[PDB]
Structures are given as structure tokens and as C-alpha cells.
Amino acid sequence: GARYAARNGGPEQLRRNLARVVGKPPADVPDDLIRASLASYARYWREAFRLPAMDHGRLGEQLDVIDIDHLWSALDAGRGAVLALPHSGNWDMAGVWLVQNYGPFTTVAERLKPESLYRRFVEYRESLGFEVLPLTGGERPPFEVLAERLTDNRPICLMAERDLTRSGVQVDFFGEATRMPAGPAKLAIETGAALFPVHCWFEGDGWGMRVYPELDTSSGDVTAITQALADRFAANIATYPADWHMLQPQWIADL
């Protein structure tokens, strides 16, 4: 019921999510923003098609990342780093930038059906240089392989603003209840890795990317950490609202 509806969407569900971003009823969401959001949504897929075929050496030299030194200094400190970002802009282009300026990083992939579809997504992201760990059905437990990368002073990247299963962390998101994955907060606690909020967007015909100051994981409270994670994502999504490709149900109430 809710698990099926939670993996559907389209322009109608997009309006309901952007309604929270702008703070207006669904019918009052600007028609120009919906068009910009669908246009941004189309661009990611248009780029995801040709991204494995482009000159990644060019992309790494010419694209920039705001406050990238936040990540370098944390890797210079031997701590590892957790990069948690929302589904905004082109994050596969951001990974390309990291593969060229640092090297391969690790991530997790939901085991989609059919398997052939899942196989294609692995190939796609592996052809970009990412390490893809199966969230289920794999050889090793995903949470524990990632923890090894973090204590090994390596970066992992997690799409970390949506997880509407029984195991999601409930947080406030534009004043309403949603659920986000616990992975990012739990991995910074258990391993001490630096937890950096990350945001990607479309800067004209280019790509905008930014690393934000790492969150305080001193409390060991997954909710308090994930809530600060939600606060940062909401602050960034509000700046580039059209570049947030959330056509799926996001908030608990819409299920």
C-alpha cells in the first residue's frame, strides 16, 4: 500500500512536495517552478545517459566544488568522511568530479527488480568509478563494508534525505514529518568519520556543487544529528528548489 505508492510519483506528487518547499497549498505552487522542476528532472536523465561517455578528465579540471577543502582536511586528518546529500542536481556528475580529484568512493544500491535493471545501474555507476555495494543480497553487510572504508580514511557517498521504511529516522523537513536514512549518522558515530552535508544543483549549463561544515556527532543521538542533516538539506533545497528531483512521496502524511 504505502510501500508501493512511496515508489510512484509524477507531476502531481511533485507539486505536493514543492508545496512544502515554498510553503503554499499545492494549487498555489508556481506553475513556472513545476516546469523548471520537470525540466531539471529531464536534464539529469539526459546527462545520466551520456555521462559514462564524456571526458571525465575535462570535467574534473573545469568543475568546482564550494568548500571542497572541508573534505580534504578531514581526509588529511585520517578520519574518513561521510558525504550525505539529497536528490538534487546531478550527483553522478559530482561523483565523477570526486573520482578524478580523489579517486573511487563507495556507495550502496537498492536491489531493484528486475535484476537486469539493477545490473545496469551498477554498470553505469561503476563505469563512472564508483564502488556499488548491494543494500541486500550481497556478499557482505553493507553497513560494515562502509564502516571499513571510513576507518580506512576513505569517503563514502549516501543519498540521505529519504527513507520511508520502518527503519527510517523521523525528522522535521519544511515543517512536516518525513523520514531519512540512519546510515549517515550511525556511520559518523560508530567510526568517528566526518559527516559533511553535500548539495548538487544545475548552475546554468554547468554544475554547482558544495561541501558544508561537518555536523557535530558528539551527542551520539541519531535524531539530533539527522535533524541537523535535515535542516541543512532543507536550507539548500530552498535555494535551488527546482533542482530537487523528488517526484516520489517524501513526507509521511502523503502515504
Ligand X SMILES: OC[C@H]1O[C@@H](O)[C@@H](O)[C@@H](O)[C@@H]1O
Question: Residue ranges for the binding site for hexadecanoyl-CoA?
Answer: 87, 125, 167, 190
Distance between CA atoms of residues 86 and 161, nearest Å: 5
Q: Which residue is nearest to ligand PLM (CB)?
A: 95
Q: Closer CB to ligand X, residue 121 or residue 153?
A: 121
Instruction: Judge contact between 78 and 190, C-beta under 8 A.
Output: no
Contacting positions for ligand X (CB under 6 A): 87, 159
Please return the burial class of 151, using the count of CB atoms within 10 Å of its CB with bins 0-12, 13-18 and 19+. Answer: middle
Active-site residue identified among 70, 87, 199, 245: 87
Q: Closer CB to ligand PLM, residue 125 or residue 186?
A: 125
Q: Closer CB to ligand PLM, residue 19 or residue 200?
A: 200
Among 84, 108, 189, 228, binds ligand PLM (CB under 6 A): 108
From the list 28-36, 101-109, 137-145, 240-248, the region that binds ligand PLM by CB under 6 A is: 101-109
Q: Is 239 left (phi over 0), alpha (psi -120 to 50) or beta?
A: alpha
Q: Least distance in Å: CB of 87 to ligand X?
A: 6
Spell out where the chain is interrupted, by the residue before each break (C to N > 2.5 A).
none
157 binds ligand PLM (CB under 6 A): yes
Q: Least distance in Å: CB of 62 to ligand PLM?
A: 15
Q: Closer CB to ligand X, residue 93 or residue 225?
A: 93
Residue of 90, 73, 82 whose CA lies nearest to 107: 82
Q: Least distance in Å: CB of 201 to ligand X?
A: 15
Look-up of cell digits 570535467: 59
Q: Say whether 56 is catalytic.
A: no
Q: Closer CB to ligand PLM, residue 174 or residue 201?
A: 201
Q: What are phi and psi of 110, to 5 degrees?
A: -60, 135
Q: What are phi and psi of 89, to 5 degrees?
A: 55, -145
Active-site residue identified among 70, 131, 161, 245: 161
Q: Say whether 148 is catalytic.
A: no
Residue of 223, 149, 226 whose CA lies nearest to 191: 149
Distance between CA atoms of residues 147 and 3, nearest Å: 28
Q: Is 8 left (phi over 0), alpha (psi -120 to 50) or beta?
A: beta
Among 79, 125, 186, 245, binds ligand PLM (CB under 6 A): 125
Distance between CA atoms of residues 61 and 13, nearest Å: 38
159 binds ligand PLM (CB under 6 A): yes
209 binds ligand PLM (CB under 6 A): yes
Q: Which residues are catalytic?
A: 87, 161
**Binding footprint of ligand PLM on the chain (CB under 6 A):** 65, 71, 83, 91-92, 94-95, 98, 107-110, 125, 157, 159, 198, 209, 211
